[PDB]
RNA sequence: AGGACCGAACCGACUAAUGUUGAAAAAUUAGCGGAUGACUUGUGGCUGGGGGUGAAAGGCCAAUCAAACCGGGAGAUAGCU
RNA sequence: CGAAGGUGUGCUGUGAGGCAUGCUGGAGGUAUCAGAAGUGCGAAUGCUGACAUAAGUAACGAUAAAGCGGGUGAAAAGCCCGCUCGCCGGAAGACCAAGGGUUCCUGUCCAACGUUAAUCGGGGCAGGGUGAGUCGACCCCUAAGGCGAGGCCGAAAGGCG
């Protein structure tokens, strides 16, 4: 049985945050919190409180066993990109992005 | 002599504030929203007519509506007139 | 090249340095244990040290000297009056460096430095 | 100083191919206290080899 | 702080608030609200800035063009 | 540097507000144009 | 006394470097000239486009000038791309 | 008992194309034979919107400078309190006019804004706040100048006074 947990609008880049993801992808959920709690990147705080999510989603609505349970799938998205002007000299203009991420975690016993 | 129309038509409401009732418990001074166009005079005769006590000074000011945003759309609060109504000593009011 | 040379620059201008680490010295002592960089901590040792093993010989001279490093009276107290005693048969290591992790503003390894004979 | 053509999405992936983060290898346990902690660092209750180096 | 008191109790000090007004979505309206007003402005501006442009011109291009 | 707009309310309102405007012929031609055209604010004047 | 001298405010802009997707659609830094006079500045006013003004460079007239800007004739015309 | 449209597959025609059907979709479509066209796009330094690239690169706005303890808080290099350090000091201090127009103060919030975080803010939300016979304006007076009863002049508008 898979549990999903998404961040979706997760403002940050997609390219950040799948440095991340791709630590945790296919490891037991005690490895993937310990080195999520040890890497000192932005995207590990979003995506551990996206796994920390579906774990309890998965206890709660599933009565899926913690010690079994196993990162099955992990991808971020991308969002929707909200644009910002940022000044530049001699008049010109230049249109900033500012990217969102839509984080998707599932986890389950397989 | 001011109508007592008019007198009854100058007086809005009390203003209750913590300025106000500083004013009115050391000064002795009320604090009440009037009407735009009323003037000191007519404040004055329309305390001392429909509250029957007597009044020493009337200070007026007024105040500028603040502009506000119901959700996106822009909107502005009207202006409106403040008098500081100091009255004699001994006389009091609920 | 930086062949066999010392002192670490830390982005800083050469009184931004001794007045932080005059600073930071003072606080040491003043609290016994702080918490900041690992790099700074490791030049402060290079300046604490050296204020207690002057502070092993309590002469007027040497009250002025380490109140010409300190410029504080109540930290030129505590070192001839309390630290001098404390670590009169050490030699030297005075102080510990503790690594505590990163701060959260901009992943900068910190450290704890403390005195020896704290607890 | 600037393209002449368009880099490719095959150029971007063998670029980042070097781009890619080194996950710790193993978590210290501490003897009293025996909670997780990076190797030469103190734990999060302020234990490092064993003794109480700080409060909290 | 009341969102919007579709009206506000006095009575007791209260306020009935429906509206969504200042609502996450009313904040991507006045994202919305920069969002084209600047961009209207962009143009306008790299319109009315990127003009005296060198381009080489005033010094080099003038000399080739000889 | 100084740019050319250093404002005045009342040099505004003597050459382009409401009564510099109907004073002439065709200052009253550019408010009847503002009013076919439908304009919120027909002048300067505050 | 002085369209006198040196020199800050103030006014200006001779030289160099930086910068040139600038901090800045002309500036900063180090020096520089005048500095009681044909000085400078505030506020308000007047002069209108083949017209103004100009110690005169075709200079300036709202970052636009060998004839401003806006609207209209107007879908000018283009044996040219 | 599933239209158009979308997405596949199979078949078919010399071609533009055509037919059947699976999934999605959930209400319209239209044979034939005629008729009328805003009737077919890859280019026009074409127009509008969206998304790439360079690239997670340059940069994060004066080289006046920061350090520590405690607090709050989900979280503190940036907030508050404190002790030190440094900078301006004919200003980088204080008071106004012009101009702006509530940016003032208090409480609360952190999505957006702020070139980072933010518990903070000139940000959002709510409330409060500007008190005059003497200050200033208004007002009496006129300058440059403007308007201008009559008037003079001018095709008209209007110009001058
Ligand atoms: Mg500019
Ligand atoms: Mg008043
Ligand atoms: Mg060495
Ligand atoms: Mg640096
Ligand atoms: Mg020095
Ligand atoms: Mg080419
Ligand atoms: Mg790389
Ligand atoms: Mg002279
Ligand atoms: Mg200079
Ligand atoms: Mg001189
Ligand atoms: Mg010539
Ligand atoms: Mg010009
Ligand atoms: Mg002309
Ligand atoms: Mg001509
Ligand atoms: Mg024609
Ligand atoms: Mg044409
Ligand atoms: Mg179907
Ligand atoms: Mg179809
Ligand atoms: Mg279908
Ligand atoms: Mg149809
Ligand atoms: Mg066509
Ligand atoms: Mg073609
Ligand atoms: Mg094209
Ligand atoms: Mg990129
Ligand atoms: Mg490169
Ligand atoms: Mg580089
Ligand atoms: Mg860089
Ligand atoms: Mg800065
Ligand atoms: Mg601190
Ligand atoms: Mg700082
Ligand atoms: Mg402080
Ligand atoms: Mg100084
Ligand atoms: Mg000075
Ligand atoms: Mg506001
Ligand atoms: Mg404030
Ligand atoms: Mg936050
Ligand atoms: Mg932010
Ligand atoms: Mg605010
Ligand atoms: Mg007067
Ligand atoms: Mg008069
Ligand atoms: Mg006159
Ligand atoms: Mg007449
Ligand atoms: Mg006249």
Known sequence: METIAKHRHARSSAQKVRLVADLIRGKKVSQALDILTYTNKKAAVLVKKVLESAIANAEHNDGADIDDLKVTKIFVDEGPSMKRIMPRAKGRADRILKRTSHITVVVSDR | ?94 | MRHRKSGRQLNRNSSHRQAMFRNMAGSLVRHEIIKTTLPKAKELRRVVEPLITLAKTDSVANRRLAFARTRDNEIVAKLFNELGPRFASRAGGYTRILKCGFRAGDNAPMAYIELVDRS | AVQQNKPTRSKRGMRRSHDALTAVTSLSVDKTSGEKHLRHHITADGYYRGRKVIAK | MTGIVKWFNADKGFGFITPDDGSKDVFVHFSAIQNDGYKSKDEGQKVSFTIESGAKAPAAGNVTSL | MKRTFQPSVLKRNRSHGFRARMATKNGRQVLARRRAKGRARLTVSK
């Open chain 2, 1 to 94: 002599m001011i109508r007592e129309e008019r007198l009854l038509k100058v007086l809005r409401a009390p203003h209750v504030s913590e300025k106000a009732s500083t004013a009115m418990e050391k000064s002795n001074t009320i604090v009440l929203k009037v009407a735009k166009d009323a003037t000191k005079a007519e404040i004055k005769a329309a305390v001392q007519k429909l509250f029957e006590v007597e009044v020493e000074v009337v200070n007026t000011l007024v105040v500028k509506g603040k502009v506000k945003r119901h959700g996106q759309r822009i909107g502005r609060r009207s202006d409106w007139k403040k008098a500081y109504v100091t009255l004699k000593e001994g006389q009091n009011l609920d």
